[PDB]
Design a protein around this ligand. Structure first.
Ligand SMILES: O=C1NCCc2[nH]c(-c3ccnc(-c4cnc5ccccc5c4)c3)cc21
Length: 283
Protein backbone atom coordinates (compact mmCIF):
# COMPACT_ATOMS: atom_id res chain seq x y z
CA UNK A 1 0.00 0.00 0.00
CA UNK A 2 2.22 2.84 -1.35
CA UNK A 3 1.00 6.42 -1.62
CA UNK A 4 3.08 9.55 -2.37
CA UNK A 5 2.14 13.13 -1.60
CA UNK A 6 0.15 15.29 -3.99
CA UNK A 7 1.31 18.53 -5.48
CA UNK A 8 1.04 21.59 -3.27
CA UNK A 9 1.35 24.70 -5.42
CA UNK A 10 3.03 27.53 -3.48
CA UNK A 11 1.57 31.02 -3.83
CA UNK A 12 4.06 33.34 -2.17
CA UNK A 13 6.29 35.37 -4.47
CA UNK A 14 9.00 33.01 -5.43
CA UNK A 15 11.68 35.56 -4.68
CA UNK A 16 10.83 35.43 -0.99
CA UNK A 17 12.67 32.07 -1.34
CA UNK A 18 15.20 32.07 -4.19
CA UNK A 19 17.64 34.53 -5.77
CA UNK A 20 16.71 34.50 -9.39
CA UNK A 21 19.46 35.04 -11.92
CA UNK A 22 19.24 35.40 -15.70
CA UNK A 23 21.83 32.76 -16.62
CA UNK A 24 20.10 30.42 -19.08
CA UNK A 25 20.52 26.72 -18.52
CA UNK A 26 18.42 25.26 -21.30
CA UNK A 27 15.49 25.91 -23.61
CA UNK A 28 12.23 24.09 -23.43
CA UNK A 29 9.31 23.45 -25.63
CA UNK A 30 7.52 26.22 -23.75
CA UNK A 31 9.82 28.11 -21.39
CA UNK A 32 13.52 28.68 -20.82
CA UNK A 33 15.29 27.49 -17.73
CA UNK A 34 17.23 29.90 -15.51
CA UNK A 35 19.72 29.12 -12.76
CA UNK A 36 18.54 30.20 -9.31
CA UNK A 37 19.79 29.92 -5.75
CA UNK A 38 17.95 29.11 -2.59
CA UNK A 39 18.46 32.40 -0.69
CA UNK A 40 18.46 30.48 2.62
CA UNK A 41 20.96 27.82 1.52
CA UNK A 42 23.07 29.07 -1.33
CA UNK A 43 22.42 25.71 -3.11
CA UNK A 44 21.55 25.81 -6.81
CA UNK A 45 18.42 25.00 -8.69
CA UNK A 46 16.84 25.27 -12.07
CA UNK A 47 13.72 27.31 -12.68
CA UNK A 48 11.42 26.93 -15.66
CA UNK A 49 8.74 29.58 -16.15
CA UNK A 50 5.45 28.93 -17.90
CA UNK A 51 2.44 31.09 -18.56
CA UNK A 52 -0.41 29.49 -16.64
CA UNK A 53 -2.85 28.03 -19.01
CA UNK A 54 -3.79 24.49 -19.47
CA UNK A 55 -1.01 23.16 -21.67
CA UNK A 56 1.17 24.18 -18.73
CA UNK A 57 -1.03 22.88 -15.99
CA UNK A 58 -0.59 19.55 -17.73
CA UNK A 59 3.23 19.62 -17.96
CA UNK A 60 3.33 20.34 -14.25
CA UNK A 61 0.63 17.76 -13.57
CA UNK A 62 2.33 14.98 -15.55
CA UNK A 63 5.87 15.83 -14.55
CA UNK A 64 4.93 15.94 -10.91
CA UNK A 65 3.43 12.51 -11.31
CA UNK A 66 6.60 11.18 -12.86
CA UNK A 67 9.00 12.99 -10.57
CA UNK A 68 9.18 9.92 -8.34
CA UNK A 69 11.36 8.02 -10.80
CA UNK A 70 15.10 8.23 -10.07
CA UNK A 71 15.79 8.84 -13.72
CA UNK A 72 13.41 11.69 -14.17
CA UNK A 73 14.49 15.17 -13.10
CA UNK A 74 12.99 15.91 -9.70
CA UNK A 75 10.53 18.75 -9.16
CA UNK A 76 11.35 20.57 -5.96
CA UNK A 77 8.45 23.06 -5.77
CA UNK A 78 5.88 24.73 -7.95
CA UNK A 79 4.82 28.32 -7.50
CA UNK A 80 1.81 30.15 -8.91
CA UNK A 81 2.77 33.84 -9.02
CA UNK A 82 1.90 37.02 -10.87
CA UNK A 83 4.46 38.20 -13.38
CA UNK A 84 3.55 41.32 -15.32
CA UNK A 85 -0.14 41.07 -14.58
CA UNK A 86 -0.02 37.58 -16.08
CA UNK A 87 -0.35 34.50 -13.99
CA UNK A 88 2.61 32.14 -13.96
CA UNK A 89 3.51 28.60 -13.06
CA UNK A 90 7.12 28.52 -11.91
CA UNK A 91 8.67 25.07 -11.63
CA UNK A 92 11.70 24.71 -9.48
CA UNK A 93 13.64 21.58 -10.17
CA UNK A 94 16.84 20.04 -8.97
CA UNK A 95 19.87 21.27 -10.85
CA UNK A 96 21.47 18.95 -13.33
CA UNK A 97 24.88 20.52 -13.59
CA UNK A 98 26.61 17.47 -15.04
CA UNK A 99 25.71 18.50 -18.60
CA UNK A 100 23.78 16.81 -21.36
CA UNK A 101 24.55 13.11 -22.04
CA UNK A 102 26.31 13.33 -25.34
CA UNK A 103 28.55 15.99 -23.98
CA UNK A 104 29.89 14.07 -21.10
CA UNK A 105 30.58 11.45 -23.78
CA UNK A 106 32.23 13.74 -26.27
CA UNK A 107 34.69 14.75 -23.50
CA UNK A 108 37.22 12.07 -22.57
CA UNK A 109 40.69 10.92 -23.73
CA UNK A 110 37.03 5.59 -25.21
CA UNK A 111 33.44 4.59 -24.81
CA UNK A 112 32.59 0.81 -24.45
CA UNK A 113 29.67 -1.25 -25.87
CA UNK A 114 29.03 -1.98 -22.23
CA UNK A 115 28.81 1.64 -21.08
CA UNK A 116 26.36 2.19 -23.91
CA UNK A 117 24.29 -0.70 -22.62
CA UNK A 118 24.37 0.80 -19.15
CA UNK A 119 23.25 4.23 -20.40
CA UNK A 120 20.54 2.78 -22.55
CA UNK A 121 19.22 0.94 -19.57
CA UNK A 122 18.77 4.08 -17.43
CA UNK A 123 17.00 5.93 -20.19
CA UNK A 124 14.97 2.78 -20.51
CA UNK A 125 14.04 2.84 -16.86
CA UNK A 126 12.78 6.37 -17.16
CA UNK A 127 10.60 5.45 -20.10
CA UNK A 128 9.42 2.28 -18.49
CA UNK A 129 8.27 4.15 -15.38
CA UNK A 130 6.47 6.70 -17.52
CA UNK A 131 4.71 4.14 -19.64
CA UNK A 132 3.73 2.11 -16.68
CA UNK A 133 1.64 5.03 -15.46
CA UNK A 134 0.42 5.96 -18.90
CA UNK A 135 2.50 8.91 -19.82
CA UNK A 136 4.25 9.06 -23.17
CA UNK A 137 7.13 11.48 -23.17
CA UNK A 138 6.85 12.20 -26.85
CA UNK A 139 10.17 14.06 -27.00
CA UNK A 140 13.01 11.93 -25.82
CA UNK A 141 16.07 13.47 -27.38
CA UNK A 142 19.72 13.93 -26.48
CA UNK A 143 19.23 17.51 -25.31
CA UNK A 144 16.75 16.21 -22.76
CA UNK A 145 19.09 13.80 -21.05
CA UNK A 146 21.19 15.53 -18.42
CA UNK A 147 23.61 14.28 -15.82
CA UNK A 148 23.00 15.22 -12.22
CA UNK A 149 26.60 16.20 -11.64
CA UNK A 150 30.10 15.96 -13.02
CA UNK A 151 31.04 13.22 -10.62
CA UNK A 152 31.65 10.03 -12.55
CA UNK A 153 28.80 8.15 -10.87
CA UNK A 154 26.18 10.86 -11.40
CA UNK A 155 22.66 9.98 -12.52
CA UNK A 156 21.19 10.39 -15.98
CA UNK A 157 17.88 12.16 -15.86
CA UNK A 158 15.17 12.77 -18.45
CA UNK A 159 13.64 16.27 -18.72
CA UNK A 160 11.02 18.39 -20.39
CA UNK A 161 7.44 17.23 -20.20
CA UNK A 162 6.42 19.85 -22.67
CA UNK A 163 4.97 17.21 -24.97
CA UNK A 164 4.27 14.56 -22.43
CA UNK A 165 0.72 13.38 -22.88
CA UNK A 166 -1.57 10.92 -20.95
CA UNK A 167 -2.64 7.80 -22.82
CA UNK A 168 -6.11 6.61 -21.88
CA UNK A 169 -7.44 -8.30 -23.30
CA UNK A 170 -5.23 -5.20 -22.80
CA UNK A 171 -6.82 -3.55 -25.83
CA UNK A 172 -10.19 -3.93 -24.03
CA UNK A 173 -9.08 -2.24 -20.77
CA UNK A 174 -8.83 0.95 -22.85
CA UNK A 175 -7.86 1.71 -26.49
CA UNK A 176 -4.60 3.66 -26.65
CA UNK A 177 -2.86 5.45 -29.54
CA UNK A 178 0.67 4.91 -30.85
CA UNK A 179 1.69 7.53 -28.33
CA UNK A 180 4.21 5.38 -26.57
CA UNK A 181 5.78 3.82 -29.66
CA UNK A 182 6.96 7.34 -30.33
CA UNK A 183 9.30 6.97 -27.33
CA UNK A 184 10.52 3.52 -28.32
CA UNK A 185 11.64 5.03 -31.64
CA UNK A 186 13.51 7.86 -29.91
CA UNK A 187 15.06 5.21 -27.80
CA UNK A 188 16.31 3.40 -30.87
CA UNK A 189 17.80 6.57 -32.35
CA UNK A 190 19.68 7.42 -29.23
CA UNK A 191 20.96 3.86 -28.89
CA UNK A 192 22.15 4.11 -32.47
CA UNK A 193 24.03 7.27 -31.87
CA UNK A 194 25.44 5.98 -28.64
CA UNK A 195 27.08 3.13 -30.47
CA UNK A 196 28.78 5.02 -33.26
CA UNK A 197 28.68 8.78 -32.82
CA UNK A 198 26.22 9.67 -35.57
CA UNK A 199 22.47 9.35 -36.13
CA UNK A 200 21.00 6.69 -38.38
CA UNK A 201 19.14 9.22 -40.48
CA UNK A 202 21.45 11.64 -42.23
CA UNK A 203 20.88 15.10 -43.84
CA UNK A 204 23.28 16.01 -46.72
CA UNK A 205 17.10 17.07 -46.34
CA UNK A 206 13.94 16.49 -48.31
CA UNK A 207 15.63 13.11 -48.59
CA UNK A 208 16.15 12.83 -44.85
CA UNK A 209 12.43 12.89 -44.28
CA UNK A 210 12.20 10.12 -46.92
CA UNK A 211 14.96 7.95 -45.53
CA UNK A 212 13.18 8.29 -42.20
CA UNK A 213 9.82 7.33 -43.65
CA UNK A 214 11.34 4.47 -45.65
CA UNK A 215 13.54 3.19 -42.89
CA UNK A 216 16.77 3.59 -44.83
CA UNK A 217 19.80 3.29 -42.61
CA UNK A 218 22.86 1.07 -42.51
CA UNK A 219 25.36 -0.06 -39.92
CA UNK A 220 28.49 1.21 -41.75
CA UNK A 221 32.05 0.07 -41.05
CA UNK A 222 34.38 0.96 -39.14
CA UNK A 223 32.25 2.46 -36.50
CA UNK A 224 30.11 -0.63 -36.43
CA UNK A 225 32.54 -3.30 -37.53
CA UNK A 226 32.93 -4.31 -33.91
CA UNK A 227 29.22 -4.20 -32.75
CA UNK A 228 27.16 -7.34 -32.08
CA UNK A 229 24.55 -8.60 -34.50
CA UNK A 230 22.44 -9.12 -31.38
CA UNK A 231 22.58 -5.36 -30.90
CA UNK A 232 21.93 -4.28 -34.47
CA UNK A 233 18.91 -6.57 -34.33
CA UNK A 234 17.70 -4.68 -31.25
CA UNK A 235 18.18 -1.28 -32.88
CA UNK A 236 16.28 -2.68 -35.82
CA UNK A 237 13.19 -3.52 -33.83
CA UNK A 238 13.16 -0.08 -32.36
CA UNK A 239 13.55 1.76 -35.63
CA UNK A 240 10.73 -0.14 -37.26
CA UNK A 241 8.71 2.27 -39.37
CA UNK A 242 5.41 0.66 -38.49
CA UNK A 243 4.62 1.81 -34.94
CA UNK A 244 2.80 -1.35 -34.02
CA UNK A 245 5.61 -3.57 -35.35
CA UNK A 246 7.93 -1.68 -32.99
CA UNK A 247 9.32 -3.17 -29.74
CA UNK A 248 7.65 -2.17 -26.47
CA UNK A 249 9.36 -0.65 -23.47
CA UNK A 250 8.85 -3.94 -21.65
CA UNK A 251 10.41 -6.15 -24.29
CA UNK A 252 13.28 -3.66 -24.36
CA UNK A 253 13.90 -3.81 -20.66
CA UNK A 254 13.94 -7.59 -20.85
CA UNK A 255 16.17 -7.90 -23.86
CA UNK A 256 19.46 -9.40 -22.67
CA UNK A 257 21.66 -6.66 -24.01
CA UNK A 258 19.91 -4.37 -21.56
CA UNK A 259 18.89 -6.74 -18.80
CA UNK A 260 22.48 -7.73 -18.17
CA UNK A 261 24.62 -4.61 -18.72
CA UNK A 262 27.59 -6.20 -17.04
CA UNK A 263 27.45 -9.36 -19.27
CA UNK A 264 28.17 -7.03 -22.17
CA UNK A 265 31.56 -6.84 -23.96
CA UNK A 266 33.76 -3.98 -22.99
CA UNK A 267 34.45 -3.56 -26.75
CA UNK A 268 35.43 0.04 -27.67
CA UNK A 269 33.35 2.14 -29.95
CA UNK A 270 34.25 5.14 -32.07
CA UNK A 271 31.54 7.27 -30.45
CA UNK A 272 33.68 9.68 -28.58
CA UNK A 273 36.09 10.43 -31.47
CA UNK A 274 33.18 10.80 -33.93
CA UNK A 275 31.33 13.10 -31.52
CA UNK A 276 34.28 15.56 -31.34
CA UNK A 277 35.06 15.05 -34.98
CA UNK A 278 31.64 16.32 -35.80
CA UNK A 279 31.00 18.94 -33.12
CA UNK A 280 30.16 21.24 -36.01
CA UNK A 281 27.27 19.80 -37.92
CA UNK A 282 26.03 18.48 -34.53
CA UNK A 283 23.14 21.04 -34.51
O1 LIG B 1 12.38 20.98 -18.96
C1 LIG B 1 13.36 21.24 -19.66
N1 LIG B 1 13.16 21.48 -21.03
C2 LIG B 1 14.24 21.88 -21.96
C3 LIG B 1 15.62 21.45 -21.48
C4 LIG B 1 15.71 21.54 -19.96
N2 LIG B 1 16.80 21.65 -19.20
C5 LIG B 1 16.44 21.53 -17.92
C6 LIG B 1 17.31 21.57 -16.83
C7 LIG B 1 16.88 21.17 -15.56
C8 LIG B 1 17.79 21.12 -14.51
N3 LIG B 1 19.06 21.46 -14.71
C9 LIG B 1 19.52 21.86 -15.90
C10 LIG B 1 20.87 22.19 -16.02
C11 LIG B 1 21.61 22.55 -14.89
N4 LIG B 1 22.90 22.81 -14.96
C12 LIG B 1 23.58 22.74 -16.12
C13 LIG B 1 24.94 23.03 -16.15
C14 LIG B 1 25.63 22.99 -17.36
C15 LIG B 1 24.96 22.64 -18.53
C16 LIG B 1 23.60 22.34 -18.50
C17 LIG B 1 22.91 22.39 -17.29
C18 LIG B 1 21.55 22.12 -17.24
C19 LIG B 1 18.64 21.92 -16.99
C20 LIG B 1 15.12 21.36 -17.87
C21 LIG B 1 14.63 21.36 -19.11
Amino acid sequence: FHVKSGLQIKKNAIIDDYKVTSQVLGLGINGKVLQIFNKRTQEKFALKMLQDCPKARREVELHWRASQCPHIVRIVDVYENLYAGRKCLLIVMECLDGGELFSRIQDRGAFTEREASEIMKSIGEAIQYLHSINIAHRDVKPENLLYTSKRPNAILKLTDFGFAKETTAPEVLGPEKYDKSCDMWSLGVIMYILLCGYPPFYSNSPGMKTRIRMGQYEFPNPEWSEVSEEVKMLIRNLLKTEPTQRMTITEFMNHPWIMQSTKVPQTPLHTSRVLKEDKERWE
